[PDB]
């Protein structure tokens, strides 16, 4: 939809990735101020409000902690407490039809000052006073739901821009929306460090002849020294041997 009908999508249980935004795919803009671009894919976030809609491209440069403008304070407010990032991509063909796409309108001259992250799906008659008009804007109200240029080559003042604003709240119990541990390949017959789902150690780990049970993960000895393990990805059994030492 357009910005006047902006989509509030509560989204979680996902894989936060910034590669798709710039380098995996060359979307127009990925902008934010407090959270680093590179740290999105390795921190785990509970839930995120996604503001997914289409806005005028002319006021995308209005998108800032302040920088009030047509969109920034009349179509959707972007305050300083921007705990998240905005992902916009140009949609010249997608949101501008040659024959007139009189559907992705914009809420011009909004009724009231935009509330903090207001659900500006409010699509009503622009407020002027206490006059009960007969459905016709009289002398002080325009048509707030006004149409863009709607050309395939929209000017600088009417560019078509798609927007997903991610604002993340990790205050609630985690829904674990993040990439899981970066699982490398497996090493046989080499003294290496290792972390298996919380089990931290260092040794040489090799193929085994022991047989486990479906509920069993670890393996010990007389003195509670970890001796066997199962690969988290797939069913198999690896013995662990300490790296050699001695006297010289």
């Amino acid at each position, epitope marked *: 939809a357009s910005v006047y009908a902006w989509n509030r999508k509560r989204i979680s249980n996902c894989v936060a990735d910034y590669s798709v935004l710039y380098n995996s795919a060359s979307f127009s803009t990925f902008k934010c101020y407090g959270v680093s671009p590179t740290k999105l894919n390795d921190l785990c976030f509970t839930n995120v409000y996604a503001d997914s809609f289409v806005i005028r491209g002319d006021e995308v440069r209005q998108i800032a902690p302040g920088q009030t403008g047509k969109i920034a304070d009349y179509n959707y407010k972007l305050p300083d407490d921007f705990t998240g990032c905005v992902i916009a991509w140009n949609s010249n063909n997608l949101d501008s039809k040659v024959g007139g796409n009189y*559907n992705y309108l914009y809420r011009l001259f909004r009724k009231s000052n935009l509330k903090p992250f207001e659900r500006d799906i409010s699509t009503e008659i622009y407020q002027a006073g206490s006059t009960p008009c007969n459905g016709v804007e009289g002398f002080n109200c325009y048509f707030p*739901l006004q149409s863009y240029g709607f050309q395939p080559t929209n000017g600088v003042g009417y560019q078509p821009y798609r927007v997903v604003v991610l604002s993340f709240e990790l205050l609630h119990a985690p829904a674990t929306v993040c990439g899981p541990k970066k699982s490398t390949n497996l090493v046989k017959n080499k003294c290496v460090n290792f972390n298996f789902n919380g089990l931290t150690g260092t040794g040489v780990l090799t193929e085994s002849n022991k047989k486990f049970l479906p509920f069993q993960q670890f393996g010990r000895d007389i003195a509670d020294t970890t001796d066997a393990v199962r690969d988290p990805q797939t069913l198999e059994i690896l013995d662990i041997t300490p790296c050699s030492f001695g006297g010289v």
Partner: antibody, heavy 127, light 113 residues
């Protein structure tokens, strides 16, 4: 069960703006497309507009494109279509329908094969 | 708008006999897979409208499968294999790719004696 309640129209003298509302149930709102399709009493059905999982509206009909304004209230499962200059071509039973296809109907939103239909409004043009 | 028409508009058909109806659209419906989008629907005075066949040829649910769809691009011909007073009525077809969408006249199908 399913029973899509749409209303908002009535003794409407032409040249005024309203907000037709459809409430729907039996599914998940913000992941299925609700479509306005008009059908005047004595006249055949005609597509008006739609809104999808990404609120993906598309357009309006032949001579009505632009006066209408499509907005969604995802939480309470509501769909508000703005009414401007409702005349004999602009008045009809504003049926709200759901397409059976799931996410990524292909690129386009699920908007075809909408066999399930609610009860449209009764916008009237004579006072 | 879309210049949409149906043929024949009003043919006398005796119930129990096949009946061919058409649709000519104006704006193309081809995605890059060979997709035909002009679904076939039916309208009955008193009850909810019937969706005849979705995606042109995939016989839609909720109605008897006696309708058979064919065609390509914007041309969409549905032949009712054996229409019954239950399947006789006003006929329409809907498309959902490029706005605006404008409909046909609506093929009136009734009982022929």
């Amino acid at each position: 069960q399913v029973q899509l309640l749409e209303s908002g129209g009535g003794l409407v003298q032409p040249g005024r703006s309203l907000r037709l509302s459809c409430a729907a149930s039996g599914f998940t709102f913000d992941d299925y497309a609700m479509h306005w399709v008009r059908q005047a009493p004595g006249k055949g059905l005609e597509w008006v507009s739609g809104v999808s999982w990404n609120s993906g509206t598309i357009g309006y009909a032949d001579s009505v494109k632009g006066r209408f304004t499509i907005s969604r209230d995802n939480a309470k499962n509501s769909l508000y279509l703005h009414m401007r200059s409702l005349r004999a071509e602009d008045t009809a039973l504003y049926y709200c329908a759901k397409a059976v296809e799931m996410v990524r109907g292909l690129g386009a939103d699920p908007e075809y094969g909408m066999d399930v239909w609610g009860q449209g409004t009764t916008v009237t043009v004579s006072s | 708008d879309i210049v949409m028409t149906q043929s024949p508009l009003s043919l006398p058909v005796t119930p129990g006999e096949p009946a061919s109806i058409s649709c000519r659209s104006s704006q193309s419906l081809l995605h890059s897979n060979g997709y035909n989008y002009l679904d076939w629907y039916l309208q009955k005075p008193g009850q909810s409208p019937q969706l005849l066949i979705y995606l042109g040829s995939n016989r839609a649910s909720g109605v008897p499968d006696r309708f058979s769809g064919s065609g390509s691009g914007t041309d969409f011909t549905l032949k009712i294999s054996r229409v019954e007073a239950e399947d006789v009525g006003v006929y329409y077809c809907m498309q959902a790719l490029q706005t605006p969408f404008t409909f046909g006249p609506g093929t009136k199908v009734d009982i022929k004696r």
